[PDB]
Design a protein around this nucleic acid. Structure first.
Lengths: 97, 57, 35, 74, 225
RNA sequence: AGGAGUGGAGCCUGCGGCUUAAUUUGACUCAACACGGGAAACCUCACCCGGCCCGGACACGGACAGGAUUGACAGAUUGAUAGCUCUUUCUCGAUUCCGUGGGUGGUGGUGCAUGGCCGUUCUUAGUUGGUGGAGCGAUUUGUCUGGUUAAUUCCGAUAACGAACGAGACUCUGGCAUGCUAACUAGUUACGCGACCGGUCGGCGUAACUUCUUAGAGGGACAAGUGGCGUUCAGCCACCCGAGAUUGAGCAAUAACAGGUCUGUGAUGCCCUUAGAUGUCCGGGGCUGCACGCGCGCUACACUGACUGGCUCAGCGUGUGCCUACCCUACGCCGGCAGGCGCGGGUAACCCGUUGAACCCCAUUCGUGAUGGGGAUCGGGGAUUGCAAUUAUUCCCCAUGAACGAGGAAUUCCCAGUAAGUGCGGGUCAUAAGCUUGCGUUGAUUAAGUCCCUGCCCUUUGUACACACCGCCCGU
């Protein structure tokens, strides 16, 4: 899998706090223009979220070398089924009426 | 702006090329007025595709 | 995945001269008058 | 279609698993049954790490792991 | 950030192409037709022309929100400096993108290929087109790949007028046996003003104004009030 | 009855079988062979002297505190500041350790499963319905005797009429405006100073709506005028007048190739490789050698062949701080100028730049010619500064002679600003070129024809061919 765990827990926390992102399709690249400055090296962070969304039970939308992920009900349902953290930590999805 | 490429995605066939071309036309108009009027006159709902820049000397 | 369907008409037009000429002819005849 | 064609040599290789001794003697050794184990030579008092920096001894030119530390008299 | 005019224009074109491709594959199921970008002082709007806007905006504008968020987060637009709208296209039957998508979804949705293509063709012509042509190439059953071509009406192939008079689109349909290509060409009708078709007429068409009528008897006797 | 440029006289690459290890994957007549934009030291290299890091959702065998992964030049591996000397063991202490598997997919196979794109048939004019005529029918007419055209382009004829593509029109591009639109970035100035014994004098001096330059709105060419030929039709030829009496190109029918591309692509169906997923490891001799076994190339023959930074001369374009800290360079470093050091300009009609070691020309000179006149391996003076260069980066010259003055059968390209000579940009890229793609500059000889060769198209004709003459077929 080529992944550590400490950065893994940190990236789960970051993914909780953000939820919806757009990512590039790289693996070993620690310099991504739009996903820097997370107090963690960007290689582990960016690959980590790619693997977080690419387990086999969450969809994607991708072309032109870029991953697009929108928070469907499958994202929230897998959040519940895997992390077992209820959404009362309010995400960025419950605004903009 | 010219870009000449090979037509084929493979390397087969007679050597035929595409000569793509981009033309960039640019104009300068210089005048003397207070900036309030230039802000008034820039707001003319310029059609898309025409980059407009206003600079002071 | 899915597969596109064929009317007996286009089936006959495609397989009029093939191993399946008899079958497509019979199915087209069944389409045109099969009551 | 073509590889480096490296298959004639080494048809089958045994696993490179090391049978390292479980009972550590080089790293930790007491043979005194005492809470206080010491070194007969003066210990390096550097404070950039803990007070119990573990250093092993060999014939010469020990490899430690971080910077290949060597017992020297400056 | 200072950048040369050539590089700026090329990067603008690249952004337009990437955005078009992304939201094409994102909402082609929603009858996507085209995208336009208006850059104005502090206002960078993205207009999405699509046949059906019910799912383009979704419910309570959720989908429009997600599209704006992903576009801003990918292309590095300042937060809230890009607002993308969605408006319908008045004539759906004169866009080859929309009609090629429609033919794809009629082929995928289950229909005889000749029936689906003839329905598309009929719709194109009642929409007012001067002519149309649909060519379907690929596995039409069997090992070999056949290509059918239904051309109804008139259409040009050569010269400059093809750029502004013939609008074409190519789509790939992924079937269980392979890929089927659908190519749709529509020759727009001449239309002065209104932008449904092209403005300038065909260069080989010479129109004649009718000279003023003259109906006078042997003796000029006019009707007056 | 024509020639010009010679694959052999002035710079290498692609491909086809073998030295233990090299002639490193698709494509093989036109329609493969500097083609895959394919100029590969790493990286996308994968015939490289030996290999290490990783692989796992679905059914799995060895069911967890070491079961060792990448950092020591010294007393070593056939290279290898990776540690495999049988050794080595504080740096996340869940990188998970060997097993054909659908893999957070493979530049793995199949282009005889496909899409898209491209090439070609085919650079030539060709192709098709509807209704009507002919035929039992396949089919045919329309789509033609003839003239004309580059053209199925027109005139005309006419059992066809009315149409649809292609050709043409069209788009870009040149060639012309003492007219228009007007420009503190290049180009004027006599209410001018930087001048004496009535000739305008360059960091600065720029209320002429501009001629040189830029680019737009238009103009302009139509076989329009005249003469001749021709059904006096379509047209053709010639000649004044004209900037010009068809400048380049681009686009481009119908029907097809089992044409090339699965190694351009999350464009793809089906099926399958290694546990070094072409996941990674600036780890690690894969070429570029010289029987022309082949193909593309690097290729001017004496006054004309060459030197007064010499008063002719370029134009097409490129150029930098979001992973471009690998941009274009002026000026001063003075071993003799590109140049390793400084200091500035330019995101550009602004700086390089009126384009930083220039052509053709010019008494270094040959009143003829193996000399001064042109480069025969091949050494230096300072080195553009590149993990190597040699096993492709890198810069003037001393006269020791190069078959030193038209070239085996076999052939390629070409009709005017063309061939050829000549250099300069762009792509590739680090300045990376003998490649290609463009641009200028010097600048012709031949021809205004033909169907002899090679082929194409329009008709008639023969056919025992239809896999269509690379056909069919006859006899021991």
């Amino acid at each position: 899998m080529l992944m550590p765990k400490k950065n893994r827990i940190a990236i789960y926390e970051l993914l909780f706090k953000e939820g919806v992102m757009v990512a590039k399709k790289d693996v070993h690249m620690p310099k991504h223009p739009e996903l820097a400055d997370k107090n963690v090296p960007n290689l582990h962070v960016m690959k980590a979220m790619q693997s977080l969304k690419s387990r086999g039970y969450v969809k994607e939308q991708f072309a032109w070398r870029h991953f697009y992920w929108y928070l469907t009900n499958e994202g929230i349902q897998y959040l519940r089924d895997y992390l077992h953290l209820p959404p009362e930590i309010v995400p960025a999805t419950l605004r903009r009426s | 702006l010219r870009i000449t490429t090979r037509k084929t995605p493979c390397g087969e066939g007679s050597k035929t090329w595409d000569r793509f071309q981009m033309r960039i036309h640019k104009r300068l108009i210089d005048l003397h007025s207070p900036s309030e009027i230039v802000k008034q006159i820039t707001s003319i709902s310029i059609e898309p595709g025409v980059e407009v820049e206003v600079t002071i000397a | 995945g899915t597969d596109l369907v064929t009317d007996p008409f286009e089936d006959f037009e495609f397989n009029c001269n093939t191993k399946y000429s008899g079958g497509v002819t019979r199915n087209l005849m069944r389409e045109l008058n099969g009551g | 279609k073509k590889r480096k064609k490296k298959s004639y040599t080494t048809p089958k290789k045994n696993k490179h698993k090391r049978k390292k001794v479980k009972l550590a003697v080089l790293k930790y050794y007491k043979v005194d049954e005492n809470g206080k184990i010491s070194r007969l030579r003066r210990e390096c008092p550097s404070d950039e790490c803990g007070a119990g920096v573990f250093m092993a001894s060999h014939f010469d030119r020990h490899y430690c792991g971080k910077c290949c530390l060597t017992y020297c008299f400056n | 950030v200072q950048i040369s005019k050539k590089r700026k224009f090329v990067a603008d074109g690249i952004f337009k192409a990437e955005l078009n491709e992304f939201l094409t594959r994102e909402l082609a199921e929603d009858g996507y037709s085209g995208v336009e970008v208006r850059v104005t002082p502090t206002r960078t709007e993205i207009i999405i022309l699509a046949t059906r806007t019910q799912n383009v905006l979704g419910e309570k504008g959720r989908r429009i929100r997600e599209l704006t968020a992903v576009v801003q987060k990918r292309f590095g637009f300042p937060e809230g400096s890009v607002e993308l709208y969605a408006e319908k296209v008045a004539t759906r039957g004169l866009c080859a993108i929309a009609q090629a998508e429609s033919l794809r979804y009629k082929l995928l949705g289950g229909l005889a290929v000749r029936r689906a293509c003839y329905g598309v063709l009929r719709f194109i012509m009642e929409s007012g087109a001067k002519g149309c042509e649909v060519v379907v190439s690929g596995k039409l059953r069997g090992q070999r790949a056949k290509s059918m071509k239904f051309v109804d009406g008139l259409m040009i192939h050569s010269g400059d007028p093809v750029n502004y008079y013939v609008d074409t689109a190519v789509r790939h349909v992924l079937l269980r046996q392979g890929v089927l290509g659908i190519k749709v060409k529509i020759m727009l009708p001449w239309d002065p003003t209104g932008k449904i078709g092209p403005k300038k007429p065909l260069p080989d068409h010479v129109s004649i104004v009718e000279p003023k009528d003259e109906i006078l008897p042997t003796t000029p006797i006019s009707e007056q009030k």
